From Swiss-Prot, chain A:
It comes from Homo sapiens (Human). This is Glutathione S-transferase A1. SUPFAM superfamilies: GST C-terminal domain-like, Thioredoxin-like. The isomerase activity is inhibited by S-methylglutathione (GSMe). The keyword NADP does not apply. The gene is GSTA1. PANTHER family: GLUTATHIONE S-TRANSFERASE, GLUTATHIONE S-TRANSFERASE A1.
Amino acid sequence: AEKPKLHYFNARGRMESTRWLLAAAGVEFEEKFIKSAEDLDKLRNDGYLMFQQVPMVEIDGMKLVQERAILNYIASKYNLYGKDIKERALIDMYIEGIADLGEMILLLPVCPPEEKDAKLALIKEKIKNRYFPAFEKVLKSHGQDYLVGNKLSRADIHLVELLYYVEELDSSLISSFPLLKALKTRISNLPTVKKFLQPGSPRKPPMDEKSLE
Amino acid sequence: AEKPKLHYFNARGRMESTRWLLAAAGVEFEEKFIKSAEDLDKLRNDGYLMFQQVPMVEIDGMKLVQERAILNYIASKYNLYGKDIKERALIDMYIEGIADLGEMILLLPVCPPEEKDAKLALIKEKIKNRYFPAFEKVLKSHGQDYLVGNKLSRADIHLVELLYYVEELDSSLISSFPLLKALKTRISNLPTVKKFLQPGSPRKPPMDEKSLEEARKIFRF
């Protein structure tokens, strides 16, 4: 079929988790970067963005917008969404927690400077006291190499992606969570993920001081 | 056939869309209202809340948190998530747009007072120029009574819920969108939804300033 085509800025933002998931699935995809106001205006004007926003992914004849819609479809299509309704429920619970933490970190830069040191401190306390304990407990409960169904799912991918973001922020935060560290290592050595973390992949760098929109 | 048990404050918040969905599906549920910071602490200390937050719904042996996990489960179980993964992709795309607008409206009462006039104006502009046109376009595309697959789905239920909240904000916003008005009327006349909209159901009122400070007390913010 058509290779999926990802429309977004040349940046992580709200498209990165899709890059991770497709790459983890071994799926060949192409990207078309939005470099100007004019590029975005053209996609909007031509009718390809349901709510006038990117990310947008062309896949299987659809022009899919909304990160969560894109990710749900990709996960099902490539058998990364568990095997039944109840496994999808655990997966969804897990990944919605990951997205709540992720959203805090995503938005930390565009915070006002006088709130920004306090928001960081609250993120670190939630990481230590709420989120990392919750995922460590799941991994402890069954002792298996994957979060759900003893099989690779989107939840392992989304989690390990966030573990890399948390490491960028503060490498000490994972230190009391040995099962989270071990997950990071195993997932990162899966052939597809190993290739994605290697240079020359679609994986994107963190945003730097030169972030002018 | 144990009834779902919904753990939340006596208010709409992040549990109201689940009330709508369950009611639309003809499913009877019970609610256990959190009325103090002590009640919430107890849920947490009893290990009921994976991430120390509500909403939480006890359903089929699970203690499900996260509004989207709860809704996704109920929708799939009651055949309101479309017939296949491509129909689910359309449903997800539509309901995530609805969620984005619903989020702006939900947070309006805690908007910094100094930002509230500008924010209210921006939401009304997004309704008239972004969201309402997108759904009017989908409805005009197929001319069918439902958003996806010519069949009732969660997308119809969540959209119509939102149309009621937008009417509360400003009743004029829908006036240029005939097909949305028509969808509102059709969905509102389905028996389960008509029962839910009538006086006496578990449907919750708008948050007033009282309910808001009560939330501040319990949530500790």
